Design a binder for this molecule. Sequence first.
Ligand SMILES: NC(=O)c1ccc[n+]([C@@H]2O[C@H](COP(=O)([O-])OP(=O)(O)OC[C@H]3O[C@@H](n4cnc5c(N)ncnc54)[C@H](OP(=O)(O)O)[C@@H]3O)[C@@H](O)[C@H]2O)c1
Ligand SMILES: NC(=O)c1ccc[n+]([C@@H]2O[C@H](COP(=O)([O-])OP(=O)(O)OC[C@H]3O[C@@H](n4cnc5c(N)ncnc54)[C@H](OP(=O)(O)O)[C@@H]3O)[C@@H](O)[C@H]2O)c1
Lengths: 305, 305
Amino acid sequence: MDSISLRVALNDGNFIPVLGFGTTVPAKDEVIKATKIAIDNGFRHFDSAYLYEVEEEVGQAIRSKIEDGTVKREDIFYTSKLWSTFHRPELVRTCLEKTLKSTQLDYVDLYIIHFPMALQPGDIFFPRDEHGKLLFETVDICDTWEAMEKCKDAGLAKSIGVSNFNCRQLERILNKPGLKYKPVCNQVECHLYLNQSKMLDYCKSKDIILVSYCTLGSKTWVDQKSPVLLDDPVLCAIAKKYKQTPALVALRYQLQRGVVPLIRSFNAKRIKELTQVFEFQLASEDMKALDGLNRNFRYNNAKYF
Amino acid sequence: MDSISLRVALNDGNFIPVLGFGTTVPAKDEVIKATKIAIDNGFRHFDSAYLYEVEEEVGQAIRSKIEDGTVKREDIFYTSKLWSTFHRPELVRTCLEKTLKSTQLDYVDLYIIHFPMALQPGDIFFPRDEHGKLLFETVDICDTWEAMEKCKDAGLAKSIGVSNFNCRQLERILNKPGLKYKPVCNQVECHLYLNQSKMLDYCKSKDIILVSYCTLGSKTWVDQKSPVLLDDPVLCAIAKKYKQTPALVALRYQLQRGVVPLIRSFNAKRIKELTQVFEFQLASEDMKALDGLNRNFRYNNAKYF
Ligand SMILES: NC(=O)c1ccc[n+]([C@@H]2O[C@H](COP(=O)([O-])OP(=O)(O)OC[C@H]3O[C@@H](n4cnc5c(N)ncnc54)[C@H](OP(=O)(O)O)[C@@H]3O)[C@@H](O)[C@H]2O)c1
Ligand SMILES: NC(=O)c1ccc[n+]([C@@H]2O[C@H](COP(=O)([O-])OP(=O)(O)OC[C@H]3O[C@@H](n4cnc5c(N)ncnc54)[C@H](OP(=O)(O)O)[C@@H]3O)[C@@H](O)[C@H]2O)c1
């Protein structure tokens, strides 16, 4: 409570709280209680999406705190994402309007395209053919982007950005003739093992913020790899040295390099743990040491990449 | 209520209700309410497992109905499965005892080895190296089997069987010198696209019942063939002809060929739908037609095979 709700600038004049809180269940019912505990602890940046099927639950939690006067609408930064089946220029706002109806907020502070790939419009999140294969559809991202800009103009989304865009896809938008508004962020997976320096540097020059997910490394018989990031000896070494936890040093690392981290805990003790992230600093030797962990490993829980 | 709780013989003198009900969440809290609605509708065969982490919830649901006198302990057939970390002969009963403690039942009607592979004993379901790879362990299934037989002798498990065993693994048990009790079943994935005729015929000769899961066909950008079995045109054709639903014909097909199906619905209308499965019959032309769908596709949601 206090510093983790302080803001960083967006290229459109808006500011975003420096630490975000993800809203993804693993009972929907627990989402609302976690959001409430999070808000009481200083969190002002909530990240959800159409896909998550929990925006209703997140709205109730947010509005409970507006009602009890803990927070005002303007104190909350709420992010939502456009789902793939709604990539057609005409269906973009349909998607956003469903979010606004579900959350009961008048607008969203940040609307971002969840993925660049488009899927056929329907009532299914991931539609498939007879052989159970995804029904992709070709819709030029510049067309979806234009629809996004219309959303911002209509005042339904304060800011607009993207998520999971690579260098060429990001450039495509930036070089689209008649660009009205450029993305304010690029939400990508980023952590000690997949640090995204190229992407980060590119963003800094384009004046775009990189929002990280799977920051702390995020039951089946097969997948062979997933090293548990928080068990890393170098990390545990440096945590032990600063008398911190592996998770805080991992988070502090993202903050010091200019990334707006996304975290998520449904545990009241771990939620409070995270608010102490600004209580120390990583000395450069330690920063370089951490940069060394980059082994380019992607968890890609969504099997997208 | 009435016919779906009628029993079929087991090779050890016991009988098993003809239609089973699976207990796998997708809130634990909803499991107990579904089990109760299921029991009120005639279901007497409940299938759970150590792995599911819901045996406690299933016990409360079962015992609520014993208490209200709807059902007696002897009317319920409860199945549980030995988890892989408990494959060592010494840890087998530890596993079963945890189940009995968790469910508060004096014994289980059927105890089966969930998978043939063994994993190192621990407090983790799926233990992995510092490199994200499963800690397998070699324990001869005939040794685990011997431990199982001891469970039946101790009267902790009325019947014992296996799950996910292929032809050679199944034979290994059947040919183990000094076999005391042979498995009563082999719980395997079986449905219109993966019908298991070889396995079924083998079982019929060995006098072993084949219990099916993923009967009705049971997400992600994985262009991962997830053909929706209930959307199959041939199925929908034959359903339409009998004025039934795709799901009932799919279920009736398993019943007519000698399989004890496992189903699962947390929806009170679909639970009641399923009790009407014996209200019609599939004429042989239709049976052969359905047999034709066998395209050998495995959903293997557990990524085991
Ligand atoms: N744009 C996209 O495509 C995309 C994709 C994935 C996620 N996201 C966003 O990112 C959010 C978080 O994603 P994620 O869960 O994958 O990221 P993550 O933060 O790396 O993983 C969350 C895990 O960290 C554990 N944890 C939390 N606080 C901790 C602490 N103090 N110490 C140790 N462990 C801690 C949590 O478990 P416990 O509760 O046990 O601590 C949880 O299992 C999502 O809700 C969503 O908002 C976006
Ligand atoms: N031995 C093993 O390794 C193993 C592995 C997997 C499963 N199992 C057992 O099998 C049980 C069921 O497994 P499963 O869920 O994979 O099998 P499944 O029955 O093929 O899949 C269940 C799905 O069928 C839908 N459904 C249920 N009734 C329906 C109806 N009347 N009409 C149309 N759809 C219907 C349910 O959703 P709705 O609620 O929306 O209807 C649910 O999504 C498990 O709980 C477990 O007991 C064992």
